Ligand binder design. Structure first.
Ligand SMILES: CCCCCCC[C@@H](C)CCC[C@H](C)CCC[C@H](C)CCC[C@H](C)CCC[C@@H](C)CCCOP(=O)(O)O
Ligand SMILES: *[C@@H]1O[C@H](CO)[C@@H](O[C@@H]2O[C@H](CO)[C@@H](O)[C@H](O)[C@H]2NC(C)=O)[C@H](O)[C@H]1NC(C)=O
Ligand SMILES: [Cl-]
Ligand SMILES: [Cl-]
Ligand SMILES: [Cl-]
Ligand SMILES: [Cl-]
Ligand SMILES: [Cl-]
Ligand SMILES: [Cl-]
Length: 374
């Protein structure tokens, strides 16, 4: 427990044009527990050879997953994202459709960990490193080794440092597992988010947060562990344990989270800048959306492939912003960049003369304008 339902978002990276190669993205989020089945379908057949990020979660602790593959839109062929979850009666198939528009400061670095305990002697585990919303690391479970997803994932650390880190992680895992395997009278899931935010001005902000069955359990605030008020005897127990019984583990954590993490983080940024990519022009295109009702249209404006994140997108009549404009979420793209789509609902007659306007930092001040037409 408890149960949350997956939001499902399907979208293409480029304008859809028959025979021309494209990328199909599927973003599955908001779910809990972590047990899930996601498949990209072509004409009902599951597509093998797809890319998927490792499992992560939000501040809410709900899980999310990115999927994508290469595909070609055609007149005949039908594509879908198929999801199966404990909160679904039947599997949900959401089609991708050109004419529906797809269907549906500070930097931070964190290590994310999910533990799934079905019983005493059976448990799943997985973890991964994330630079902002960008995964930079996986973790091989059998070997107990780090997986560096990119040419810069090492981030200006020597090999000795990272070896020591691997072993530190190994023993940390052995420790907690033994620790959770004790305390036995029972299905449950444990999530850990640990790492650092780096802020303008250089002040690091450390965090180590745990959750249980998707519930806020404990955290680490300024050299002292804190329980989230349940109460909460479990959290208070384990906190108290860490605070005193074995302190010195927290010396490591404290060091690791206030030092090494911001240094590694900065190392990633440095090594990252070499390859790509400072700024990227989006491309934009219009499509219809799902019909809002008889005698009404939904206009969809797609903005895809922009980086950095900040965008301004609006439906216009001349200089007048449209009141009804609805901005979707900013979603991740196949390799690194960003996707967003804005919709508007309008009567048939009032469709003509509406424009979608895009402002991005990389456009050099010359905005993208797209005019609706039939
Ligand atoms: C099966 C799940 C595997 C999960 C491992 C996935 C790891 C996967 C992301 C590899 C990326 C590695 C990445 C390249 C190097 C980043 C270096 C950063 C600065 C280190 C931050 C380490 C975290 C913050 C401290 C952990 C808390 C433990 C030390 C204390 C706990 C109490 O002890 P106890 O338990 O004994 O009682
Ligand atoms: C956790 O629950 C039981 C605990 O033993 C596991 O039971 C095993 O189930 C599979 C297939 O049914 C096999 O490993 C054996 O038949 C069972 N083991 C024993 C010792 O009887 C179970 O598989 C674990 N997790 C599940 C069922 O998801
Ligand atoms: Cl293959
Ligand atoms: Cl289509
Ligand atoms: Cl260090
Ligand atoms: Cl159109
Ligand atoms: Cl960004
Ligand atoms: Cl959306």
């Amino acid at each position: 427990p408890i149960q949350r339902t997956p939001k499902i978002q399907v979208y293409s990276r480029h304008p859809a044009e028959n025979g021309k190669s494209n990328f199909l993205n599927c973003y599955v989020s908001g779910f809990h527990p972590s047990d899930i089945e996601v498949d990209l379908l072509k004409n009902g057949e599951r597509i093998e050879k797809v890319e998927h990020s490792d499992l992560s979660f939000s501040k809410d602790w709900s899980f999310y997953l990115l999927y994508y593959t290469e595909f070609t839109p055609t007149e005949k062929d039908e594509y879908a994202c198929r999801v199966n979850h404990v909160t679904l009666s039947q599997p949900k198939i959401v089609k991708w459709d050109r004419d529906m528009g797809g269907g549906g400061e500070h930097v931070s670095f964190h290590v994310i960990q999910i533990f799934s305990f079905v019983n005493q002697s059976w448990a799943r585990g997985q973890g991964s490193g994330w630079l902002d919303e960008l995964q930079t690391h996986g973790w091989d479970s059998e070997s107990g080794t780090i997986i560096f997803l990119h040419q810069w994932s090492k981030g200006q650390f020597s090999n000795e440092e990272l070896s020591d880190l691997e072993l530190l992680f190994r023993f940390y895992l052995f420790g907690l597992t033994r620790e959770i395997q004790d305390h036995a009278s029972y299905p449950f899931e444990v999530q850990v988010k640990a790492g650092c935010e780096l802020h303008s001005g250089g002040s690091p902000e450390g965090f180590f947060q745990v959750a249980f069955n998707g519930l806020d359990l404990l955290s680490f605030q300024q050299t002292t562990w804190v329980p989230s008020p349940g109460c909460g005897s479990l959290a208070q127990s384990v906190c108290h344990l860490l605070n005193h019984q074995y302190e010195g583990v927290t010396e490591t954590v404290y060091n690791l989270i206030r030092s090494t993490c911001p240094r590694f983080l900065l190392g990633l940024l440095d090594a990252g800048k070499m390859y790509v990519h400072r700024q990227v022009k989006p491309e934009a295109w219009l499509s219809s959306g799902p019909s809002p009702g008889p005698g009404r249209l939904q206009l969809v404006c797609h903005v895809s492939g922009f980086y950095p994140k900040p965008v301004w997108v609006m439906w216009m009549r001349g200089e007048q912003e449209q009141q009804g404009t609805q901005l979707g979420d900013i979603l991740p793209n196949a390799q690194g960049t960003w996707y967003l789509r804005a919709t508007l609902d309008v009567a048939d007659g009032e469709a003509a003369g509406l424009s979608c306007r895009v402002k991005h930092s990389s456009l050099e001040g010359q905005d993208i304008i797209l005019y609706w037409h039939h």
